[PDB]
PDB file of C-alpha atoms in Angstrom:
ATOM      1  CA  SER A1325      36.751  79.861-142.573  1.00 49.41           C
ATOM      2  CA  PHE A1326      33.185  80.149-141.265  1.00 50.40           C
ATOM      3  CA  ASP A1327      34.083  80.183-137.558  1.00 52.73           C
ATOM      4  CA  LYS A1328      31.774  83.041-136.521  1.00 52.86           C
ATOM      5  CA  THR A1329      28.891  81.739-138.644  1.00 54.36           C
ATOM      6  CA  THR A1330      29.398  78.175-137.422  1.00 57.99           C
ATOM      7  CA  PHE A1331      29.459  79.286-133.784  1.00 58.27           C
ATOM      8  CA  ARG A1332      26.357  81.433-134.202  1.00 59.51           C
ATOM      9  CA  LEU A1333      24.390  78.535-135.699  1.00 60.61           C
ATOM     10  CA  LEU A1334      25.421  76.036-133.007  1.00 61.99           C
ATOM     11  CA  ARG A1335      24.821  78.625-130.267  1.00 62.89           C
ATOM     12  CA  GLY A1336      21.246  78.876-131.528  1.00 60.60           C
ATOM     13  CA  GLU A1337      20.848  75.154-130.846  1.00 59.71           C
ATOM     14  CA  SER A1338      22.433  75.549-127.415  1.00 60.42           C
ATOM     15  CA  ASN A1339      19.991  78.338-126.519  1.00 58.42           C
ATOM     16  CA  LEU A1340      17.065  76.160-127.601  1.00 59.94           C
ATOM     17  CA  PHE A1341      18.179  73.389-125.244  1.00 60.45           C
ATOM     18  CA  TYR A1342      18.592  75.916-122.449  1.00 61.29           C
ATOM     19  CA  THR A1343      15.100  77.393-122.806  1.00 62.64           C
ATOM     20  CA  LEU A1344      13.558  73.922-122.731  1.00 59.78           C
ATOM     21  CA  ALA A1345      15.539  72.506-119.805  1.00 59.11           C
ATOM     22  CA  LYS A1346      14.148  72.340-116.259  1.00 58.19           C
ATOM     23  CA  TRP A1347      15.675  71.860-112.810  1.00 58.90           C
ATOM     24  CA  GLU A1348      13.602  70.021-110.216  1.00 59.50           C
ATOM     25  CA  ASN A1349      14.483  67.884-107.188  1.00 58.45           C
ATOM     26  CA  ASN A1350      18.176  68.664-107.662  1.00 58.87           C
ATOM     27  CA  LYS A1351      18.169  67.042-111.133  1.00 60.26           C
ATOM     28  CA  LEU A1352      18.296  68.335-114.702  1.00 57.45           C
ATOM     29  CA  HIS A1353      15.377  67.580-117.041  1.00 56.36           C
ATOM     30  CA  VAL A1354      16.281  67.927-120.726  1.00 57.78           C
ATOM     31  CA  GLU A1355      13.739  68.267-123.527  1.00 56.50           C
ATOM     32  CA  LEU A1356      14.952  67.783-127.093  1.00 58.50           C
ATOM     33  CA  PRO A1357      14.234  70.600-129.563  1.00 56.80           C
ATOM     34  CA  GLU A1358      11.870  69.640-132.364  1.00 54.63           C
ATOM     35  CA  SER A1359      20.116  65.144-135.240  1.00 54.03           C
ATOM     36  CA  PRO A1360      23.316  66.181-137.042  1.00 52.34           C
ATOM     37  CA  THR A1361      24.482  67.866-133.813  1.00 51.60           C
ATOM     38  CA  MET A1362      25.178  66.274-130.448  1.00 54.91           C
ATOM     39  CA  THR A1363      24.677  68.263-127.239  1.00 56.23           C
ATOM     40  CA  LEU A1364      26.444  67.828-123.875  1.00 59.61           C
ATOM     41  CA  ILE A1365      25.421  69.667-120.694  1.00 60.93           C
ATOM     42  CA  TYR A1366      27.837  70.210-117.779  1.00 61.74           C
ATOM     43  CA  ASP A1367      27.424  71.784-114.353  1.00 59.24           C
ATOM     44  CA  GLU A1368      29.586  74.523-112.869  1.00 54.06           C
ATOM     45  CA  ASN A1369      32.270  72.033-111.803  1.00 50.36           C
ATOM     46  CA  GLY A1370      32.542  70.375-115.214  1.00 50.03           C
ATOM     47  CA  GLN A1371      30.437  67.348-114.240  1.00 50.91           C
ATOM     48  CA  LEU A1372      28.559  65.920-117.213  1.00 49.69           C
ATOM     49  CA  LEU A1373      24.866  66.112-116.367  1.00 50.81           C
ATOM     50  CA  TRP A1374      23.344  64.989-119.676  1.00 52.56           C
ATOM     51  CA  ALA A1375      24.555  63.794-123.070  1.00 53.76           C
ATOM     52  CA  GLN A1376      22.468  63.432-126.223  1.00 52.96           C
ATOM     53  CA  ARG A1377      24.619  60.416-127.189  1.00 57.15           C
ATOM     54  CA  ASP A1378      27.136  58.321-125.255  1.00 56.11           C
ATOM     55  CA  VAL A1379      30.457  58.808-127.072  1.00 54.92           C
ATOM     56  CA  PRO A1380      33.443  58.305-124.714  1.00 52.13           C
ATOM     57  CA  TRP A1381      36.211  59.282-127.157  1.00 50.34           C
ATOM     58  CA  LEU A1382      34.487  62.626-127.790  1.00 48.89           C
ATOM     59  CA  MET A1383      33.936  63.426-124.100  1.00 46.46           C
ATOM     60  CA  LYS A1384      37.693  63.155-123.592  1.00 45.16           C
ATOM     61  CA  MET A1385      38.213  65.885-126.251  1.00 43.60           C
ATOM     62  CA  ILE A1386      36.028  68.533-124.548  1.00 43.63           C
ATOM     63  CA  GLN A1387      38.721  70.343-122.567  1.00 44.98           C
ATOM     64  CA  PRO A1388      37.513  71.246-119.042  1.00 48.17           C
ATOM     65  CA  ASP A1389      38.974  74.751-119.231  1.00 48.70           C
ATOM     66  CA  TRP A1390      36.775  75.485-122.266  1.00 49.66           C
ATOM     67  CA  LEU A1391      33.653  75.139-120.088  1.00 48.72           C
ATOM     68  CA  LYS A1392      34.217  78.476-118.281  1.00 49.93           C
ATOM     69  CA  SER A1393      33.670  80.718-121.291  1.00 50.74           C
ATOM     70  CA  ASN A1394      31.612  81.149-124.423  1.00 50.33           C
ATOM     71  CA  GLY A1395      33.559  80.177-127.502  1.00 49.07           C
ATOM     72  CA  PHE A1396      34.158  78.196-130.672  1.00 52.45           C
ATOM     73  CA  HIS A1397      36.499  75.210-130.884  1.00 51.69           C
ATOM     74  CA  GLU A1398      37.348  72.424-133.299  1.00 51.22           C
ATOM     75  CA  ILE A1399      38.281  68.883-132.365  1.00 50.76           C
ATOM     76  CA  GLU A1400      40.280  66.507-134.540  1.00 52.70           C
ATOM     77  CA  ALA A1401      38.960  62.935-134.475  1.00 49.86           C
ATOM     78  CA  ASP A1402      40.543  59.813-135.933  1.00 47.56           C
ATOM     79  CA  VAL A1403      38.540  58.822-139.003  1.00 46.61           C
ATOM     80  CA  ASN A1404      37.513  55.507-137.440  1.00 46.18           C
ATOM     81  CA  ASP A1405      36.086  57.346-134.438  1.00 45.16           C
ATOM     82  CA  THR A1406      34.112  59.721-136.679  1.00 45.12           C
ATOM     83  CA  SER A1407      32.946  56.640-138.600  1.00 45.84           C
ATOM     84  CA  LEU A1408      31.595  55.029-135.409  1.00 46.48           C
ATOM     85  CA  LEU A1409      29.980  58.291-134.321  1.00 46.35           C
ATOM     86  CA  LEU A1410      28.147  58.323-137.674  1.00 45.89           C
ATOM     87  CA  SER A1411      27.244  54.586-137.575  1.00 47.30           C
ATOM     88  CA  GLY A1412      23.571  55.392-138.161  1.00 44.53           C
ATOM     89  CA  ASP A1413      24.389  57.685-141.097  1.00 43.32           C
ATOM     90  CA  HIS A1414      24.662  55.014-143.763  1.00 43.18           C
ATOM     91  CA  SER A1415      24.892  57.521-146.635  1.00 45.05           C
ATOM     92  CA  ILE A1416      28.184  59.050-145.399  1.00 43.55           C
ATOM     93  CA  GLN A1417      30.120  55.825-144.706  1.00 40.86           C
ATOM     94  CA  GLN A1418      31.388  55.433-148.276  1.00 37.26           C
ATOM     95  CA  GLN A1419      33.109  58.830-148.145  1.00 36.69           C
ATOM     96  CA  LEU A1420      34.663  57.884-144.809  1.00 36.48           C
ATOM     97  CA  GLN A1421      35.797  54.531-146.188  1.00 36.70           C
ATOM     98  CA  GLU A1422      37.538  56.450-148.977  1.00 39.00           C
ATOM     99  CA  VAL A1423      39.242  58.782-146.495  1.00 39.95           C
ATOM    100  CA  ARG A1424      40.497  55.814-144.450  1.00 41.14           C
ATOM    101  CA  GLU A1425      41.723  53.935-147.522  1.00 39.62           C
ATOM    102  CA  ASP A1426      43.573  57.101-148.565  1.00 37.56           C
ATOM    103  CA  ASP A1427      45.326  57.594-145.193  1.00 37.76           C
ATOM    104  CA  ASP A1428      45.311  55.308-142.149  1.00 39.41           C
ATOM    105  CA  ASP A1429      46.085  58.362-140.009  1.00 38.20           C
ATOM    106  CA  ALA A1430      43.318  60.580-141.384  1.00 37.78           C
ATOM    107  CA  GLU A1431      41.722  63.055-138.974  1.00 41.48           C
ATOM    108  CA  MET A1432      38.289  64.683-139.299  1.00 40.90           C
ATOM    109  CA  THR A1433      37.485  68.141-137.918  1.00 43.34           C
ATOM    110  CA  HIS A1434      34.328  68.626-135.819  1.00 41.92           C
ATOM    111  CA  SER A1435      33.040  72.075-134.881  1.00 41.44           C
ATOM    112  CA  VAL A1436      32.224  72.726-131.208  1.00 40.76           C
ATOM    113  CA  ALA A1437      30.299  75.598-129.613  1.00 41.57           C
ATOM    114  CA  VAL A1438      30.667  76.111-125.862  1.00 40.14           C
ATOM    115  CA  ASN A1439      27.952  78.225-124.224  1.00 41.30           C
ATOM    116  CA  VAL A1440      27.791  79.285-120.562  1.00 36.39           C
ATOM    117  CA  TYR A1441      24.589  80.111-118.656  1.00 36.82           C
ATOM    118  CA  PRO A1442      25.032  81.617-115.162  1.00 34.58           C
ATOM    119  CA  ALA A1443      22.801  80.276-112.411  1.00 31.94           C
ATOM    120  CA  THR A1444      19.339  81.843-112.155  1.00 30.55           C
ATOM    121  CA  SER A1445      16.433  81.547-109.754  1.00 29.26           C
ATOM    122  CA  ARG A1446      15.177  78.560-111.776  1.00 29.16           C
ATOM    123  CA  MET A1447      18.386  76.888-113.029  1.00 27.79           C
ATOM    124  CA  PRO A1448      21.910  76.199-111.770  1.00 32.99           C
ATOM    125  CA  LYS A1449      24.881  77.286-113.824  1.00 34.17           C
ATOM    126  CA  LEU A1450      25.150  75.197-116.985  1.00 32.24           C
ATOM    127  CA  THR A1451      27.653  74.881-119.810  1.00 35.76           C
ATOM    128  CA  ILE A1452      26.045  73.540-122.976  1.00 35.05           C
ATOM    129  CA  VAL A1453      28.408  72.134-125.604  1.00 38.03           C
ATOM    130  CA  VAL A1454      27.076  71.553-129.125  1.00 41.26           C
ATOM    131  CA  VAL A1455      29.170  69.351-131.439  1.00 39.99           C
ATOM    132  CA  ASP A1456      28.561  68.996-135.179  1.00 43.19           C
ATOM    133  CA  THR A1457      28.760  65.261-135.889  1.00 42.51           C
ATOM    134  CA  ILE A1458      29.346  65.909-139.620  1.00 39.96           C
ATOM    135  CA  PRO A1459      33.028  66.837-140.067  1.00 43.47           C
ATOM    136  CA  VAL A1460      33.958  70.019-141.918  1.00 47.86           C
ATOM    137  CA  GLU A1461      35.744  67.957-144.581  1.00 50.32           C
ATOM    138  CA  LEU A1462      32.490  66.200-145.538  1.00 49.83           C
ATOM    139  CA  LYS A1463      29.806  68.891-145.323  1.00 47.19           C
ATOM    140  CA  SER A1464      29.847  69.177-149.135  1.00 51.18           C
TER     141      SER A1464
END
């Protein structure tokens, strides 16, 4: 329902990462903004350069063709994968346990903002992907 609002908010986080990043000696240097979101940074060929967290099941859901354009996406995660993603969020596990007990095949929806930054004199082309780790179904 809030697709444009959700994208605009996550794009703000993407832009913050971009301003703070540096490129030196053919390597990306990422500074964290002053987290309920998880950011992934790819180069112009879709190579992952930097990830805020290491989450293999989620990386497989970021479709390579998305990385060419600015846009909003949602990914559907199995509830047990969302649960693991939110392992450190002890307050939300009881709601997830209730979702799982209600339906073994439950899926959680995670918002995704894909943001493209053409190469400049100081930075190569980057695609910054910001994922909300809190699923839409549980943001209440």
